[PDB]
Symmetry: C3
Protein backbone atom coordinates (compact mmCIF):
# COMPACT_ATOMS: atom_id res chain seq x y z
CA UNK A 1 0.00 0.00 0.00
CA UNK A 2 1.39 3.42 -1.10
CA UNK A 3 -1.99 4.67 0.26
CA UNK A 4 -0.67 3.57 3.69
CA UNK A 5 0.07 6.12 6.36
CA UNK A 6 3.62 4.90 6.78
CA UNK A 7 4.39 5.46 3.13
CA UNK A 8 2.35 8.59 2.73
CA UNK A 9 3.68 10.50 5.75
CA UNK A 10 7.27 9.59 6.80
CA UNK A 11 8.68 12.72 5.27
CA UNK A 12 11.36 13.04 8.00
CA UNK A 13 12.65 9.55 7.21
CA UNK A 14 12.86 10.67 3.62
CA UNK A 15 15.00 13.67 4.57
CA UNK A 16 17.25 11.73 6.90
CA UNK A 17 17.98 9.04 4.30
CA UNK A 18 19.10 11.85 1.96
CA UNK A 19 21.41 13.68 4.41
CA UNK A 20 22.90 10.93 6.57
CA UNK A 21 25.79 10.22 4.21
CA UNK A 22 27.02 13.81 4.34
CA UNK A 23 27.02 13.80 8.17
CA UNK A 24 30.20 12.71 9.86
CA UNK A 25 31.63 11.86 13.24
CA UNK A 26 34.44 14.04 14.58
CA UNK A 27 36.78 13.29 17.45
CA UNK A 28 39.12 15.73 19.24
CA UNK A 29 42.38 14.16 20.65
CA UNK A 30 44.82 15.83 23.14
CA UNK A 31 48.34 14.78 24.19
CA UNK A 32 48.74 13.42 27.69
CA UNK A 33 50.68 15.80 30.06
CA UNK A 34 54.23 14.73 29.27
CA UNK A 35 53.65 11.95 26.78
CA UNK A 36 53.54 11.51 23.03
CA UNK A 37 50.43 9.45 23.73
CA UNK A 38 47.25 11.30 22.68
CA UNK A 39 43.75 10.40 23.80
CA UNK A 40 40.22 11.62 22.82
CA UNK A 41 39.13 14.70 24.73
CA UNK A 42 36.03 15.67 22.71
CA UNK A 43 33.61 13.94 20.33
CA UNK A 44 30.96 15.39 18.00
CA UNK A 45 29.38 15.50 14.58
CA UNK A 46 29.90 17.60 11.46
CA UNK A 47 29.00 17.57 7.79
CA UNK A 48 30.53 17.99 4.38
CA UNK A 49 30.13 21.15 2.35
CA UNK A 50 32.41 20.17 -0.57
CA UNK A 51 33.27 17.12 -2.75
CA UNK A 52 37.00 17.15 -1.98
CA UNK A 53 36.12 17.04 1.72
CA UNK A 54 35.57 20.37 3.43
CA UNK A 55 33.65 19.86 6.60
CA UNK A 56 31.92 22.20 8.98
CA UNK A 57 31.13 21.85 12.69
CA UNK A 58 30.92 24.15 15.70
CA UNK A 59 33.88 25.53 17.62
CA UNK A 60 33.19 23.15 20.50
CA UNK A 61 33.66 19.97 18.53
CA UNK A 62 36.83 21.47 17.12
CA UNK A 63 39.23 24.09 18.46
CA UNK A 64 42.66 24.98 17.00
CA UNK A 65 44.28 23.19 19.95
CA UNK A 66 44.00 19.47 19.38
CA UNK A 67 44.18 16.69 16.71
CA UNK A 68 41.03 15.77 14.80
CA UNK A 69 40.00 12.48 13.24
CA UNK A 70 36.92 12.15 11.07
CA UNK A 71 34.97 8.94 10.63
CA UNK A 72 32.57 8.58 7.72
CA UNK A 73 29.14 6.94 7.92
CA UNK A 74 30.69 4.03 5.97
CA UNK A 75 33.30 3.55 8.70
CA UNK A 76 36.67 4.65 7.28
CA UNK A 77 38.61 6.95 9.65
CA UNK A 78 40.61 9.90 8.33
CA UNK A 79 43.11 12.31 9.77
CA UNK A 80 41.49 15.76 9.28
CA UNK A 81 43.13 19.19 8.99
CA UNK A 82 41.98 22.47 10.60
CA UNK A 83 41.52 25.17 7.99
CA UNK A 84 39.82 27.80 10.17
CA UNK A 85 38.16 28.07 13.59
CA UNK A 86 36.13 31.17 14.47
CA UNK A 87 35.57 31.06 18.25
CA UNK A 88 33.27 34.16 18.40
CA UNK A 89 31.10 32.57 15.72
CA UNK A 90 31.34 29.07 17.18
CA UNK A 91 32.10 27.59 13.74
CA UNK A 92 35.00 25.45 12.54
CA UNK A 93 36.13 24.30 9.13
CA UNK A 94 38.25 21.25 8.56
CA UNK A 95 39.32 19.32 5.51
CA UNK A 96 39.94 15.64 4.93
CA UNK A 97 41.78 14.10 1.98
CA UNK A 98 39.18 11.61 0.66
CA UNK A 99 39.67 9.40 -2.38
CA UNK A 100 36.97 10.61 -4.82
CA UNK A 101 34.03 12.99 -4.80
CA UNK A 102 32.12 13.07 -1.52
CA UNK A 103 28.43 13.82 -0.90
CA UNK A 104 27.57 17.43 -0.01
CA UNK A 105 24.85 19.27 1.93
CA UNK A 106 23.82 22.58 0.39
CA UNK A 107 23.08 25.56 2.65
CA UNK A 108 19.57 27.02 2.77
CA UNK A 109 19.00 30.71 3.52
CA UNK A 110 17.96 30.76 7.21
CA UNK A 111 16.22 34.17 6.71
CA UNK A 112 13.53 32.24 4.76
CA UNK A 113 12.72 29.97 7.66
CA UNK A 114 9.20 30.45 8.83
CA UNK A 115 8.18 29.94 12.41
CA UNK A 116 6.74 26.45 12.64
CA UNK A 117 8.84 24.95 9.75
CA UNK A 118 9.79 21.33 10.50
CA UNK A 119 13.55 20.87 10.80
CA UNK A 120 15.58 17.80 11.53
CA UNK A 121 18.53 17.73 13.87
CA UNK A 122 21.08 15.13 12.90
CA UNK A 123 24.45 13.73 14.00
CA UNK A 124 26.53 10.60 14.33
CA UNK A 125 23.87 7.93 14.20
CA UNK A 126 21.20 9.99 16.08
CA UNK A 127 18.35 12.14 14.80
CA UNK A 128 15.70 14.29 16.42
CA UNK A 129 13.03 16.52 15.01
CA UNK A 130 10.90 19.54 15.89
CA UNK A 131 10.03 22.98 14.54
CA UNK A 132 11.60 26.41 14.32
CA UNK A 133 10.48 28.05 17.55
CA UNK A 134 11.67 31.60 16.75
CA UNK A 135 12.27 33.54 13.50
CA UNK A 136 21.65 35.47 16.86
CA UNK A 137 20.40 31.89 16.73
CA UNK A 138 17.69 29.64 15.43
CA UNK A 139 15.63 28.20 18.30
CA UNK A 140 13.81 24.82 18.20
CA UNK A 141 11.71 22.06 19.94
CA UNK A 142 14.17 19.45 18.78
CA UNK A 143 16.38 17.84 21.36
CA UNK A 144 20.05 18.44 20.77
CA UNK A 145 22.53 16.39 22.68
CA UNK A 146 25.99 14.80 22.21
CA UNK A 147 24.54 12.49 19.56
CA UNK A 148 23.95 15.39 17.12
CA UNK A 149 25.78 18.47 18.42
CA UNK A 150 28.02 19.91 15.75
CA UNK A 151 25.82 18.34 13.10
CA UNK A 152 23.38 20.14 10.84
CA UNK A 153 19.87 21.31 11.60
CA UNK A 154 18.05 20.97 8.25
CA UNK A 155 14.73 21.97 6.69
CA UNK A 156 12.47 19.64 4.83
CA UNK A 157 14.41 20.19 1.60
CA UNK A 158 17.62 18.79 3.11
CA UNK A 159 19.25 22.18 3.30
CA UNK A 160 21.47 22.95 6.22
CA UNK A 161 19.86 25.92 7.95
CA UNK A 162 21.86 25.57 11.19
CA UNK A 163 24.60 23.88 13.24
CA UNK A 164 23.37 22.07 16.31
CA UNK A 165 24.55 23.46 19.63
CA UNK A 166 24.17 22.28 23.26
CA UNK A 167 22.87 25.66 24.47
CA UNK A 168 19.39 25.05 25.87
CA UNK A 169 16.88 27.32 27.50
CA UNK A 170 13.62 26.19 29.05
CA UNK A 171 13.54 23.15 26.76
CA UNK A 172 14.55 25.02 23.66
CA UNK A 173 17.69 24.32 21.67
CA UNK A 174 19.95 26.71 19.86
CA UNK A 175 21.71 26.45 16.54
CA UNK A 176 24.07 28.71 14.65
CA UNK A 177 22.37 29.89 11.45
CA UNK A 178 23.40 28.89 7.92
CA UNK A 179 23.59 32.59 7.13
CA UNK A 180 26.47 32.90 9.65
CA UNK A 181 28.02 29.82 8.08
CA UNK A 182 27.75 31.32 4.61
CA UNK A 183 29.45 34.41 5.97
CA UNK A 184 32.11 32.51 7.85
CA UNK A 185 32.80 30.31 4.83
CA UNK A 186 33.29 33.16 2.35
CA UNK A 187 35.59 35.10 4.74
CA UNK A 188 37.81 31.99 5.08
CA UNK A 189 38.17 31.49 1.27
CA UNK A 190 40.24 34.68 1.47
Amino acid sequence: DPNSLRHKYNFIADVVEKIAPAVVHIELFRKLPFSKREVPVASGSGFIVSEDGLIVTNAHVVTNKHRVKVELKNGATYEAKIKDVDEKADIALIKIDHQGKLPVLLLGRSSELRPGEFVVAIGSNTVTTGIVSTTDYIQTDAIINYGNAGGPLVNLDGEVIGINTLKVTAGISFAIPSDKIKKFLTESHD
Copy 2:
Protein backbone atom coordinates in the same frame (compact mmCIF):
# COMPACT_ATOMS: atom_id res chain seq x y z
CA ASP B 1 8.69 22.74 -6.67
CA PRO B 2 5.23 22.52 -4.99
CA ASN B 3 5.95 18.74 -5.14
CA SER B 4 8.76 19.50 -2.64
CA LEU B 5 8.59 18.19 0.89
CA ARG B 6 9.00 21.65 2.37
CA HIS B 7 5.99 22.94 0.50
CA LYS B 8 3.93 19.82 0.78
CA TYR B 9 4.32 19.22 4.52
CA ASN B 10 4.92 22.40 6.62
CA PHE B 11 1.36 22.45 7.86
CA ILE B 12 2.41 23.83 11.29
CA ALA B 13 4.10 26.81 9.63
CA ASP B 14 0.85 27.36 7.81
CA VAL B 15 -1.10 27.44 11.07
CA VAL B 16 1.38 29.67 12.86
CA GLU B 17 1.40 32.25 10.06
CA LYS B 18 -2.41 32.41 10.42
CA ILE B 19 -2.54 32.83 14.23
CA ALA B 20 0.55 34.86 15.10
CA PRO B 21 -1.13 38.22 14.57
CA ALA B 22 -3.86 37.47 17.10
CA VAL B 23 -1.27 36.49 19.76
CA VAL B 24 -0.02 39.24 22.01
CA HIS B 25 2.55 39.98 24.66
CA ILE B 26 1.31 40.92 28.12
CA GLU B 27 3.28 42.51 30.94
CA LEU B 28 2.27 42.81 34.60
CA PHE B 29 3.64 45.94 36.45
CA ARG B 30 3.62 46.52 40.27
CA LYS B 31 4.33 49.70 42.25
CA LEU B 32 7.57 49.81 44.21
CA PRO B 33 7.06 49.66 48.05
CA PHE B 34 6.55 53.35 48.77
CA SER B 35 6.98 54.85 45.33
CA LYS B 36 4.80 55.94 42.44
CA ARG B 37 7.38 54.16 40.29
CA GLU B 38 6.02 50.88 38.89
CA VAL B 39 8.15 48.10 37.43
CA PRO B 40 7.36 44.82 35.56
CA VAL B 41 6.68 41.92 37.90
CA ALA B 42 5.27 39.38 35.41
CA SER B 43 5.41 38.81 31.64
CA GLY B 44 3.37 36.49 29.41
CA SER B 45 1.33 35.99 26.29
CA GLY B 46 -2.37 36.20 25.45
CA PHE B 47 -4.62 36.40 22.42
CA ILE B 48 -7.53 38.35 21.04
CA VAL B 49 -11.06 37.00 21.03
CA SER B 50 -12.80 40.13 19.66
CA GLU B 51 -12.28 42.89 17.04
CA ASP B 52 -12.55 45.80 19.49
CA GLY B 53 -9.80 44.17 21.56
CA LEU B 54 -10.92 41.64 24.15
CA ILE B 55 -8.02 39.48 25.12
CA VAL B 56 -7.73 36.28 27.09
CA THR B 57 -4.83 34.84 29.08
CA ASN B 58 -4.40 32.77 32.23
CA ALA B 59 -4.70 34.08 35.77
CA HIS B 60 -0.93 33.93 36.22
CA VAL B 61 -0.10 36.37 33.48
CA VAL B 62 -2.76 38.65 34.87
CA THR B 63 -4.23 39.03 38.35
CA ASN B 64 -6.56 41.84 39.53
CA LYS B 65 -3.65 43.31 41.51
CA HIS B 66 -1.33 45.03 39.08
CA ARG B 67 -1.18 47.22 35.91
CA VAL B 68 -1.14 45.53 32.51
CA LYS B 69 0.36 46.67 29.23
CA VAL B 70 -0.23 44.82 25.99
CA GLU B 71 2.17 44.87 23.06
CA LEU B 72 0.98 43.78 19.63
CA LYS B 73 3.00 41.66 17.19
CA ASN B 74 3.43 44.87 15.15
CA GLY B 75 5.06 46.59 18.14
CA ALA B 76 2.62 49.23 19.42
CA THR B 77 2.17 49.13 23.22
CA TYR B 78 -1.23 49.70 24.82
CA GLU B 79 -2.50 50.24 28.32
CA ALA B 80 -4.94 47.33 28.90
CA LYS B 81 -7.92 47.10 31.27
CA ILE B 82 -8.93 44.13 33.47
CA LYS B 83 -12.51 43.11 32.79
CA ASP B 84 -12.55 39.85 34.77
CA VAL B 85 -10.11 37.45 36.45
CA ASP B 86 -11.30 34.02 37.59
CA GLU B 87 -8.56 32.64 39.88
CA LYS B 88 -10.19 29.17 40.38
CA ALA B 89 -10.41 28.82 36.61
CA ASP B 90 -6.99 30.35 35.98
CA ILE B 91 -8.40 32.59 33.21
CA ALA B 92 -8.29 36.36 32.78
CA LEU B 93 -10.00 38.74 30.39
CA ILE B 94 -8.65 42.14 29.53
CA LYS B 95 -9.55 44.76 26.97
CA ILE B 96 -7.45 47.21 25.02
CA ASP B 97 -8.72 50.25 23.12
CA HIS B 98 -7.30 49.63 19.63
CA GLN B 99 -7.87 51.90 16.63
CA GLY B 100 -9.80 49.68 14.19
CA LYS B 101 -10.87 46.07 13.90
CA LEU B 102 -8.33 43.59 15.26
CA PRO B 103 -7.67 39.98 14.19
CA VAL B 104 -9.47 37.28 16.20
CA LEU B 105 -8.90 33.62 17.09
CA LEU B 106 -12.08 31.54 17.18
CA LEU B 107 -12.52 28.89 19.88
CA GLY B 108 -12.75 25.22 18.92
CA ARG B 109 -14.75 22.76 21.02
CA SER B 110 -12.10 20.91 23.08
CA SER B 111 -14.49 17.93 23.58
CA GLU B 112 -13.86 17.12 19.87
CA LEU B 113 -10.13 16.80 20.32
CA ARG B 114 -8.96 13.34 19.59
CA PRO B 115 -5.98 11.81 21.30
CA GLY B 116 -3.04 12.25 18.97
CA GLU B 117 -4.36 15.47 17.26
CA PHE B 118 -1.48 17.84 16.43
CA VAL B 119 -1.73 21.13 18.32
CA VAL B 120 0.52 24.13 18.31
CA ALA B 121 1.52 26.03 21.40
CA ILE B 122 2.19 29.67 20.71
CA GLY B 123 3.22 32.88 22.48
CA SER B 124 5.24 36.06 22.18
CA ASN B 125 7.61 35.17 19.38
CA THR B 126 7.96 31.46 20.37
CA VAL B 127 6.16 28.36 19.12
CA THR B 128 6.28 24.68 19.98
CA THR B 129 4.30 21.73 18.78
CA GLY B 130 3.19 18.26 19.83
CA ILE B 131 0.01 16.20 20.20
CA VAL B 132 -2.90 15.90 22.58
CA SER B 133 -1.67 13.34 25.09
CA THR B 134 -4.97 12.81 26.94
CA THR B 135 -8.66 13.19 25.96
CA ASP B 136 -9.73 19.23 34.06
CA TYR B 137 -7.01 19.96 31.52
CA ILE B 138 -5.72 19.13 28.09
CA GLN B 139 -2.35 17.37 28.31
CA THR B 140 0.37 17.52 25.59
CA ASP B 141 3.94 16.67 24.34
CA ALA B 142 4.51 20.29 23.46
CA ILE B 143 6.92 22.26 25.57
CA ILE B 144 5.34 25.18 27.33
CA ASN B 145 7.56 27.76 28.88
CA TYR B 146 7.65 31.55 29.51
CA GLY B 147 7.82 32.13 25.76
CA ASN B 148 4.25 30.86 25.23
CA ALA B 149 2.54 30.55 28.63
CA GLY B 150 -0.74 32.40 28.64
CA GLY B 151 -0.95 32.02 24.88
CA PRO B 152 -3.24 29.68 22.99
CA LEU B 153 -2.82 25.99 22.32
CA VAL B 154 -4.45 25.49 18.89
CA ASN B 155 -5.52 22.64 16.62
CA LEU B 156 -4.63 22.36 13.00
CA ASP B 157 -7.60 24.53 12.01
CA GLY B 158 -6.26 27.51 13.99
CA GLU B 159 -8.89 27.17 16.67
CA VAL B 160 -7.93 27.90 20.22
CA ILE B 161 -8.55 24.67 22.11
CA GLY B 162 -6.54 25.68 25.21
CA ILE B 163 -4.54 28.27 27.17
CA ASN B 164 -0.93 27.32 27.76
CA THR B 165 0.06 26.79 31.37
CA LEU B 166 3.41 26.11 33.11
CA LYS B 167 2.10 23.07 35.00
CA VAL B 168 4.19 20.10 33.89
CA THR B 169 4.20 16.48 34.90
CA ALA B 170 6.72 13.92 33.74
CA GLY B 171 7.37 15.92 30.57
CA ILE B 172 3.74 16.64 29.87
CA SER B 173 2.26 20.11 29.73
CA PHE B 174 -1.13 21.31 30.84
CA ALA B 175 -3.55 23.75 29.29
CA ILE B 176 -6.92 25.11 30.32
CA PRO B 177 -9.55 23.93 27.84
CA SER B 178 -11.42 26.19 25.40
CA ASP B 179 -14.62 24.75 26.82
CA LYS B 180 -13.75 26.35 30.20
CA ILE B 181 -12.94 29.55 28.33
CA LYS B 182 -16.28 29.48 26.54
CA LYS B 183 -17.92 29.05 29.92
CA PHE B 184 -15.86 31.71 31.62
CA LEU B 185 -16.46 34.14 28.76
CA THR B 186 -20.26 33.79 28.72
CA GLU B 187 -20.52 34.15 32.54
CA SER B 188 -18.53 37.44 32.34
CA HIS B 189 -20.82 38.96 29.61
CA ASP B 190 -23.38 39.08 32.42
Copy 3:
Protein backbone atom coordinates in the same frame (compact mmCIF):
# COMPACT_ATOMS: atom_id res chain seq x y z
CA ASP C 1 -13.78 20.64 4.64
CA PRO C 2 -11.77 17.42 3.93
CA ASN C 3 -9.33 19.91 2.29
CA SER C 4 -8.78 21.24 5.84
CA LEU C 5 -5.45 20.83 7.54
CA ARG C 6 -6.99 19.11 10.53
CA HIS C 7 -8.54 16.45 8.36
CA LYS C 8 -5.71 16.17 5.92
CA TYR C 9 -2.85 15.83 8.42
CA ASN C 10 -3.82 14.24 11.79
CA PHE C 11 -2.28 10.93 10.87
CA ILE C 12 -1.18 10.26 14.48
CA ALA C 13 -4.77 10.64 15.70
CA ASP C 14 -5.70 8.13 13.06
CA VAL C 15 -3.17 5.63 14.38
CA VAL C 16 -4.07 6.15 18.01
CA GLU C 17 -7.78 5.63 17.38
CA LYS C 18 -6.87 2.28 15.78
CA ILE C 19 -4.57 0.99 18.57
CA ALA C 20 -6.09 2.36 21.78
CA PRO C 21 -8.48 -0.55 22.26
CA ALA C 22 -5.67 -3.10 22.25
CA VAL C 23 -3.73 -1.16 24.92
CA VAL C 24 -4.44 -2.03 28.52
CA HIS C 25 -3.73 -0.92 32.04
CA ILE C 26 -1.81 -3.30 34.30
CA GLU C 27 -1.46 -3.15 38.06
CA LEU C 28 0.99 -5.08 40.25
CA PHE C 29 -0.28 -5.93 43.82
CA ARG C 30 1.88 -7.21 46.76
CA LYS C 31 0.80 -8.68 50.12
CA LEU C 32 1.37 -6.52 53.18
CA PRO C 33 4.16 -7.86 55.51
CA PHE C 34 2.12 -10.27 57.63
CA SER C 35 -1.35 -9.76 56.22
CA LYS C 36 -3.61 -11.37 53.64
CA ARG C 37 -4.32 -7.80 52.57
CA GLU C 38 -2.65 -6.97 49.23
CA VAL C 39 -2.10 -3.47 47.90
CA PRO C 40 -0.85 -2.06 44.53
CA VAL C 41 2.93 -1.81 44.33
CA ALA C 42 3.36 -1.11 40.60
CA SER C 43 1.20 0.25 37.76
CA GLY C 44 1.78 0.25 34.00
CA SER C 45 0.46 -0.42 30.53
CA GLY C 46 0.52 -3.39 28.17
CA PHE C 47 -1.19 -4.59 25.02
CA ILE C 48 -2.89 -7.61 23.57
CA VAL C 49 -1.21 -9.90 21.08
CA SER C 50 -3.99 -12.53 20.83
CA GLU C 51 -7.82 -12.76 20.67
CA ASP C 52 -8.18 -15.03 23.71
CA GLY C 53 -6.21 -12.48 25.72
CA LEU C 54 -2.44 -12.84 25.68
CA ILE C 55 -0.85 -9.61 26.73
CA VAL C 56 2.68 -8.32 26.62
CA THR C 57 4.44 -5.71 28.76
CA ASN C 58 7.94 -5.15 30.12
CA ALA C 59 9.45 -6.95 33.09
CA HIS C 60 9.07 -3.85 35.24
CA VAL C 61 5.32 -3.63 35.00
CA VAL C 62 5.19 -7.33 35.77
CA THR C 63 7.56 -9.63 37.63
CA ASN C 64 6.84 -13.24 38.69
CA LYS C 65 6.51 -12.04 42.29
CA HIS C 66 3.17 -10.31 42.66
CA ARG C 67 -0.54 -10.44 41.64
CA VAL C 68 -1.63 -8.72 38.43
CA LYS C 69 -4.96 -7.18 37.51
CA VAL C 70 -5.69 -5.93 34.01
CA GLU C 71 -8.19 -3.20 33.22
CA LEU C 72 -9.47 -2.79 29.68
CA LYS C 73 -10.02 0.55 27.93
CA ASN C 74 -13.77 -0.12 28.36
CA GLY C 75 -13.33 -0.37 32.14
CA ALA C 76 -13.84 -4.02 33.13
CA THR C 77 -11.12 -5.32 35.49
CA TYR C 78 -9.74 -8.84 35.16
CA GLU C 79 -7.51 -11.07 37.22
CA ALA C 80 -4.55 -11.83 34.91
CA LYS C 81 -2.17 -14.82 34.92
CA ILE C 82 1.63 -14.79 34.43
CA LYS C 83 2.65 -17.10 31.61
CA ASP C 84 6.31 -16.06 31.32
CA VAL C 85 8.63 -13.28 32.51
CA ASP C 86 12.08 -12.90 30.96
CA GLU C 87 14.03 -10.53 33.24
CA LYS C 88 17.17 -10.33 31.01
CA ALA C 89 14.93 -9.37 28.10
CA ASP C 90 12.71 -7.10 30.18
CA ILE C 91 9.56 -8.66 28.67
CA ALA C 92 6.56 -10.29 30.33
CA LEU C 93 3.62 -12.27 29.02
CA ILE C 94 0.35 -12.58 30.83
CA LYS C 95 -3.04 -13.94 29.91
CA ILE C 96 -6.54 -12.89 30.87
CA ASP C 97 -9.71 -14.94 30.45
CA HIS C 98 -11.91 -12.55 28.42
CA GLN C 99 -15.42 -13.36 27.20
CA GLY C 100 -15.08 -13.27 23.39
CA LYS C 101 -12.48 -12.33 20.82
CA LEU C 102 -10.33 -9.34 21.80
CA PRO C 103 -8.62 -6.77 19.56
CA VAL C 104 -4.98 -7.47 18.67
CA LEU C 105 -1.89 -5.44 17.72
CA LEU C 106 0.31 -7.10 15.11
CA LEU C 107 4.10 -6.88 15.42
CA GLY C 108 6.11 -5.04 12.78
CA ARG C 109 9.69 -6.04 11.97
CA SER C 110 11.83 -3.46 13.82
CA SER C 111 14.79 -4.14 11.44
CA GLU C 112 12.75 -2.26 8.77
CA LEU C 113 12.49 0.89 10.82
CA ARG C 114 14.22 3.75 9.15
CA PRO C 115 15.83 6.54 11.08
CA GLY C 116 13.34 9.37 11.18
CA GLU C 117 10.18 7.15 10.95
CA PHE C 118 7.34 8.61 13.04
CA VAL C 119 6.32 6.31 15.90
CA VAL C 120 3.70 6.73 18.56
CA ALA C 121 4.23 5.85 22.18
CA ILE C 122 1.03 4.82 23.89
CA GLY C 123 -0.28 3.66 27.27
CA SER C 124 -3.17 3.87 29.70
CA ASN C 125 -4.91 7.00 28.51
CA THR C 126 -1.67 8.85 27.50
CA VAL C 127 0.07 9.18 24.14
CA THR C 128 3.24 10.84 22.93
CA THR C 129 4.94 10.93 19.59
CA GLY C 130 8.35 11.43 18.00
CA ILE C 131 10.72 9.69 15.59
CA VAL C 132 13.14 6.79 15.61
CA SER C 133 16.40 8.42 16.69
CA THR C 134 18.70 5.44 16.02
CA THR C 135 18.54 2.42 13.66
CA ASP C 136 19.91 -3.48 21.80
CA TYR C 137 17.11 -0.91 21.79
CA ILE C 138 15.13 1.44 19.64
CA GLN C 139 15.83 5.07 20.62
CA THR C 140 13.33 7.96 20.20
CA ASP C 141 12.35 11.68 20.71
CA ALA C 142 9.07 10.61 22.23
CA ILE C 143 8.58 11.13 25.92
CA ILE C 144 8.01 7.93 27.81
CA ASN C 145 6.76 8.13 31.33
CA TYR C 146 4.47 6.20 33.74
CA GLY C 147 1.50 7.02 31.51
CA ASN C 148 2.80 4.79 28.68
CA ALA C 149 5.65 2.65 30.02
CA GLY C 150 5.02 -1.00 29.30
CA GLY C 151 2.82 -0.02 26.38
CA PRO C 152 3.69 -0.30 22.71
CA LEU C 153 5.78 2.01 20.58
CA VAL C 154 4.17 1.77 17.12
CA ASN C 155 4.90 2.85 13.55
CA LEU C 156 2.48 4.66 11.34
CA ASP C 157 0.89 1.37 10.25
CA GLY C 158 -0.18 0.53 13.82
CA GLU C 159 2.41 -2.18 14.17
CA VAL C 160 4.08 -2.65 17.49
CA ILE C 161 7.77 -2.08 16.86
CA GLY C 162 8.71 -1.69 20.54
CA ILE C 163 7.77 -1.78 24.24
CA ASN C 164 8.09 1.54 26.01
CA THR C 165 10.68 1.71 28.76
CA LEU C 166 11.63 4.39 31.33
CA LYS C 167 15.34 4.28 30.43
CA VAL C 168 16.27 7.76 29.22
CA THR C 169 19.52 9.27 28.09
CA ALA C 170 20.04 12.93 27.27
CA GLY C 171 16.35 13.31 26.41
CA ILE C 172 16.12 10.10 24.44
CA SER C 173 13.88 7.21 25.35
CA PHE C 174 14.47 3.51 25.00
CA ALA C 175 12.20 0.71 23.93
CA ILE C 176 12.63 -3.03 23.62
CA PRO C 177 12.35 -4.02 19.96
CA SER C 178 9.50 -6.06 18.45
CA ASP C 179 12.14 -8.40 17.08
CA LYS C 180 13.09 -9.31 20.68
CA ILE C 181 9.39 -9.72 21.42
CA LYS C 182 8.93 -12.01 18.44
CA LYS C 183 11.85 -14.03 19.74
CA PHE C 184 10.67 -14.05 23.32
CA LEU C 185 7.15 -15.00 22.25
CA THR C 186 8.16 -17.99 20.11
CA GLU C 187 10.53 -19.36 22.82
CA SER C 188 7.64 -19.25 25.36
CA HIS C 189 5.20 -21.20 23.07
CA ASP C 190 7.53 -24.12 23.78
